[PDB]
From Swiss-Prot, chain A:
Protein name, per record: Fatty acid synthase
Gene: FASN
Note: The relatively low beta-ketoacyl synthase activity may be attributable to the low 4'-phosphopantetheine content of the protein.
Residues shown, of full length: 2 to 1111 of 2511
Provenance organism: Homo sapiens
Region of interest called Acyl and malonyl transferases, as start-end residue ranges on this chain: 429-817
Keywords carried by this UniProt record: Acetylation, Cytoplasm, Fatty acid biosynthesis, Fatty acid metabolism, Hydrolase, Isopeptide bond, Lipid biosynthesis, Lipid metabolism, Lyase, Multifunctional enzyme, NAD, NADP, Oxidoreductase, Phosphopantetheine, Phosphoprotein, Pyridoxal phosphate, S-nitrosylation, Transferase, Ubl conjugation
Length: 1105, 67
């Protein structure tokens, strides 16, 4: 097979906006699980108050991903964060995303929830169609494949809490078998629906403390968390950066287990681990760290750890380190595996083991922890070196285990090339992103692998990333430059300068580059037969070195050829070639019309032939006058030399006539100057004599002429002849004409289209002003070398950087020796450095978009929470307590008002009970409660029959004074005796009320029945029924009386909590009073007024005969 | 080591049972979770191999066959 490596990695995890923040939290000991109210008001439905949650879910750069504003709102937050994280993952390894476009790379996403689909389709009258494209589970992989153009498999697994690791296993199988060249593995989980946390709590899996206390005695459950993590698996032939190598990954199911479906099986996990480490040929001792599941459940942890002990720790001597990343960030169910992988890889990169929180004592059910065979990482531990393992075990029964061989690549041995300055080019969605990349590059200026990887990913079209920047590192004058990039293709042109540019000690600052040195050596070999070496000439020190014509010409040609070679190395090819008369030679090399040896030989021969003949000295002079006007002005014996621009015209000829005309011009005051050529008037009639031998030599120099590509524009001959044969092919006649015919630089410039990127290819940018004036104002000259500058390598690199800013894609990695891969361990992470445009905030579903009139099922079986109602038996038949309806209506009002019962003081008014509901012995009876808020009325119906009617509304302004105990009409000073619980309920029995233990809550009462003490449990039904019992107790009427109407009832939980006073024993008690004169029963926070009871006929069952 | 690949794309019953926080039962997670569509089969038939629940839409069954 082929090696599988973890090229890249990225993700957003609880209280960690990026992987670097995730690490800062892991080492720093911070607890990423918080007690905030982001997803829902904490404590809702009794859920654990703590849950690790992502910092933000409302950010997404839709424009970059081709998602329209409407489609973005309807998209799932998981998918948006996943697109961003996957793009970060691809770039983390230096693999430019466009390289994988069209590849067979396949996306595997492990997901478990589709709450957004359930939310966005709740109203079938206004739901939008595109909600399914962006929220369907299948689109987690399909959307990534669509954007990135991955032609490989695109699946979305669930696998019940091991989805991420199962996807990693499938991707490893795919890349191993050669089916796919690269893979993207993702894991996503977001908490938006409280009903799911309620389900998990009911199953008994969530921890009331809200913490995953791994490997510890206090283990109760796990804390739910959100996660979005993506990894890039590639075969070793492609990886630019390697974190670890996947030795072997497997999967198996626990099968039939007598205990149940949700019972972890240790035997099967041990079997899988042993089978994998045997198939991979890896000794158990080689392992150094196994990242256990560590969910924190009481039963799971012993099984998993004992299985690990049997499989691995049985036959080794040094102890094994065990860790659980869930103790830090909580438990993202589908994405738990990839979060563990991220933790492990970060710890390996930083040379430490991220400690494990919430561990202060081992679990005594695991002998390994008690002994030394397993060692929990409660504090940082340096990475000694070995193979690691990660296993995620879903509650369905699916297990996954992967062995990892960490990357251990030491920093490269220093080489002289590392001293030379480099160039860093960045492209970002915003200026801040490019500035961030440049800053991070400047921090790590000496890490060649980091810079190479950054430069690899910066080649992205200007349309997608509109801002670009560059920074030369290793030089004193280095500062980041950033500018927005106009879109559209910009043509690239070459302008080769002329005879003037030549100075002492030129090019040595570029000899340190390789391609330049090779080009110079090839030129020296070409000119070796004639006795002079270009390298020696460049290395010379005498200021008279370049006074000779031939030395200057040959060195200039060699330097231009070297520069043109450098531009080619970076993939640059010109769409336009234009040259000054010496330059056309080099220009000819640009188009391939000449071979390098031919061009250098031609330059040398031109120089030597010029030397051979002797002519009277004549200075070529530059005059600032109109070309046509210059024609008339020019005296005899002088002809125009160069049509530099509309204003610039340099005339050459005999020294005396040129001096005379220069004096005349100086009288006029117009611009007058003469370039230095050794007093030679080039491109004038004087050159005619030199021609014949020049043509003779060049004929041998140029054996078989070749066509001049359409790109090359000839300054040698006017456009009228541009169809001519002579000017059609680079030949000896072409060079002779160039040496004779005057220069037509200005003419050739007009064909430079608008928005052209010119490059003054020469040892000195002499024509910057000429080009600036002649060309259209939009163009960009971008000069490459300069005169006397201390470090011309910096100037050339800045030129390439300006080229980059102008739109052209030039990759500077070609200039310097290639960097070996895989990259060394410890290279800075690139995921945190990629920043997006997060100006806009996209819709994210809230907790009110999920289901929560009200219908209640009263189940009186043993398991039902309402089992206490079976004690409310009157006449021998169980009846729903009168106060039971009140509690149901109260909960309904609280739910509608969106508060908890404990936080809602309520008022009932004009209540009427129309019939009694008999709780069946077997089965259930369903009561429905409807509210009319505007009328402030409520109704309770049973199978369509009215039961309770009246008014209920929130109490705007609770006032404690209402619950002060009314002064009793009877002083009762003696108080010799009181009714105990037994006696009061014995009297009630004789009257026919047969309350059971749960409704026995009158600890004591006065003989008259007006005062007493009521026991308080968490149930309001029992407390209010006991108040009604106290009211009934003091009546003189025999037989049983049931409530039929209550005028008004007030309840206030706050005053209720204040009133309750604990007894000497642990019990909580409330003091009650019954004032019959005033018709009020007050106890704690309740106030019953206007109670009316009506006698009920005895059932006369006479079961006793 | 036989394994269960199941092509499923609709978990509607999960929503219906989990719509009332007051009276929901934790069993619904075991009986309605998408992943359980295969884990229940593996549990009953005692299969020790893979148990995956693919989700590609309109091609999930044939994708499971290919896997």
């Amino acid at each position: 097979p082929e090696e599988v490596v973890i090229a890249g990695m990225s993700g957003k995890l609880p209280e960690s906006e990026n992987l670097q923040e995730f690490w800062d939290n892991l080492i720093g000991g911070v607890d990423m699980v918080t007690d905030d109210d982001r997803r829902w008001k904490a404590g809702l439905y009794g859920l654990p108050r703590r849950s690790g949650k992502l910092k933000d879910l409302s950010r997404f750069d839709a424009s970059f991903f081709g998602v329209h504003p409407k489609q973005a709102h309807t998209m799932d937050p998981q998918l948006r964060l996943l697109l961003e994280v996957t793009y970060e993952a691809i770039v983390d390894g230096g693999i430019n995303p466009d390289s994988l476009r069209g590849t067979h790379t396949g996306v595997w996403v492990g997901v478990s929830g589709s709450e957004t689909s359930e939310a966005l389709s709740r109203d079938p009258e206004t739901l939008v169609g595109y909600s399914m494209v962006g929220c369907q589970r299948a689109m987690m992989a399909n959307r990534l494949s669509f954007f990135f153009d991955f032609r490989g498999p695109s699946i979305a697994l669930d696998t019940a809490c091991s989805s991420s690791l199962m996807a990693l296993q499938n991707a490893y199988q795919a890349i191993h078998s050669g089916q796919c060249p690269a893979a993207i593995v993702g894991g996503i989980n977001v908490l938006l629906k409280p009903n799911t946390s309620v389900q998990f709590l009911r199953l008994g899996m969530l921890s009331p403390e809200g913490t995953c206390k791994a490997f510890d005695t206090a283990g109760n459950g796990y804390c739910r968390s959100e996660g979005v993590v993506a990894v890039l698996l590639t075969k070793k032939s492609l990886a630019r950066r390697v974190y670890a190598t996947i030795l072997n990954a497997g999967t198996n199911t626990d099968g039939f287990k007598e205990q149940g479906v949700t019972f972890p099986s240790g035997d099967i996990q041990e079997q899988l681990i042993r089978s994998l480490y045997q198939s991979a040929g890896v000794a158990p001792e080689s392992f150094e760290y196994i990242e256990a599941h560590g969910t924190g459940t009481k039963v799971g942890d012993p099984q998993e750890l004992n299985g690990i002990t049997r499989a691995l720790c049985a036959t080794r001597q040094e102890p094994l380190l065990i860790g659980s990343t869930k103790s830090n960030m909580g438990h993202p169910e589908p994405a738990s595996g990839l979060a563990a992988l991220a933790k492990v890889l970060l710890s390996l990169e930083h040379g430490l083991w991220a400690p494990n929180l919430h561990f202060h004592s081992p679990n005594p059910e695991i002998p390994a922890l008690l002994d030394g065979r397993l060692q929990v990482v409660d504090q940082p531990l340096p990475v000694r070196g070995g193979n690691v393992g990660i296993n995620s075990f879903g509650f369905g029964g699916s297990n996954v285990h992967i062995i990892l061989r960490p990357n251990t690549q030491p920093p490269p041995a220093p080489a002289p090339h590392a001293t030379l300055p480099r160039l860093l080019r960045a492209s970002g969605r915003t200026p801040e992103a490019v500035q961030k990349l440049l800053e991070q590059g400047l921090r790590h200026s000496q890490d060649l692998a980091f810079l190479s990887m950054l430069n690899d990913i910066a080649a992205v079209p200007a349309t997608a990333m509109p801002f670009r920047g560059y920074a030369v590192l290793g030089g004193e004058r280095g500062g980041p430059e950033v500018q927005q990039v106009p879109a559209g293709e910009r043509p690239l042109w070459f302008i080769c300068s002329g005879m003037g540019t030549q100075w002492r000690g030129m090019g040595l600052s570029l000899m340190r580059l390789d391609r330049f040195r090779d080009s110079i050596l090839r030129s020296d070999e070409a000119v070796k037969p004639f006795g002079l070496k270009v390298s020696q000439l460049l290395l010379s020190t005498d200021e008279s070195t370049f006074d000779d014509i031939v030395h200057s010409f040959v060195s200039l040609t060699a330097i231009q050829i070297g520069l043109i070679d450098l531009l080619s190395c970076m993939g640059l090819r010109p769409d336009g070639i234009v040259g000054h008369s010496l330059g056309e030679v080099a220009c000819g090399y640009a188009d391939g019309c000449l071979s390098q040896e031919e061009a250098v030989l031609a330059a040398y021969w031109r120089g030597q032939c010029i030397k051979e003949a002797h002519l009277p000295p004549g200075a070529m002079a530059a005059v600032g006058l109109s070309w046509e006007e210059c024609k008339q002005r020019c005296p005899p014996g002088v002809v125009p030399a160069c049509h530099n621009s509309k204003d610039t015209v340099t005339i050459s000829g005999p020294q005396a006539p040129v001096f005379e005309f220069v004096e005349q011009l100086r009288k006029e005051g117009v611009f007058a100057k003469e370039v230095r050529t050794g007093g030679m008037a080039f491109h004038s009639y004087f050159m005619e004599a030199i021609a014949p031998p020049l043509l003779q030599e060049l004929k041998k120099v140029i054996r078989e002429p070749k066509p001049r590509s359409a790109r090359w524009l000839s300054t040698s001959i006017p456009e009228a002849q541009w169809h001519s044969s002579l000017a059609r092919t680079s030949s000896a006649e072409y060079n002779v004409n160039n040496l004779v015919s005057p220069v037509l630089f200005q003419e050739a410039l007009w064909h430079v289209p608008e928005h052209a990127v010119v490059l003054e290819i020469a040892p000195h940018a002499l024509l910057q002003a000429v080009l600036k004036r002649g060309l259209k104002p939009s163009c960009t000259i971008i000069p490459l070398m300069k005169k006397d500058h201390r470090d011309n390598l910096e100037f050339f690199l800045a030129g390439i950087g300006r080229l980059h800013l102008s739109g052209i894609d030039a990759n500077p990695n070609a200039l310097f020796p290639p960097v070996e891969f895989p990259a060394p361990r410890g290279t800075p992470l690139i995921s945190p450095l990629i920043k997006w445009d997060h100006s806009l905030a996209w819709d994210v579903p809230a907790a009110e978009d999920f289901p929560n009139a009200a219908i209640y099922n009263i189940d009186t079986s043993s398991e039902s929470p309402d089992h206490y109602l079976v004690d409310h038996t009157l006449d021998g038949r169980v009846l729903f307590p009168a106060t039971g309806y009140l509690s149901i209506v109260w909960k309904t009002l609280a739910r509608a008002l969106g508060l908890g019962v404990e936080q809602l003081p309520v008022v009932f008014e004009d209540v009427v009970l129309h019939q009694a509901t008999i709780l069946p012995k077997t089965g259930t009876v369903s009561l429905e409660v409807r509210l009319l808020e505007a009328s402030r009325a409520f109704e309770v119906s049973e199978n369509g029959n009215l039961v309770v009617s009246g008014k209920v509304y929130q109490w705007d302004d609770p006032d404690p004074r209402l619950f002060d105990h009314p002064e009793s009409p009877t002083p009762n000073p003696t108080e010799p005796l009181f009714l105990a619980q037994a006696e009061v309920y014995k009297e009630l029995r004789l009257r026919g009320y047969d309350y059971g233990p749960h409704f026995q809550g009158i600890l004591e009462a006065s003989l008259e029945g007006d005062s007493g003490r009521l026991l308080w449990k968490d149930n309001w039904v029992s407390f209010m029924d006991t108040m009604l019992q106290m009211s009934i107790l003091g009546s003189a009427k025999h037989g049983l009386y049931l409530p039929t109407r209550v005028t008004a009832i007030h309840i206030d939980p706050a005053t209720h909590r204040q009133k309750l006073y604990t007894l000497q024993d642990k019990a909580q008690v409330a003091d009650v009073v019954v004032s019959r004169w005033l018709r009020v029963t007050v106890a704690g926070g309740v106030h019953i007024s206007g109670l009316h009871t009506e006698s009920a006929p005895r059932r006369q069952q006479e079961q006793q005969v």
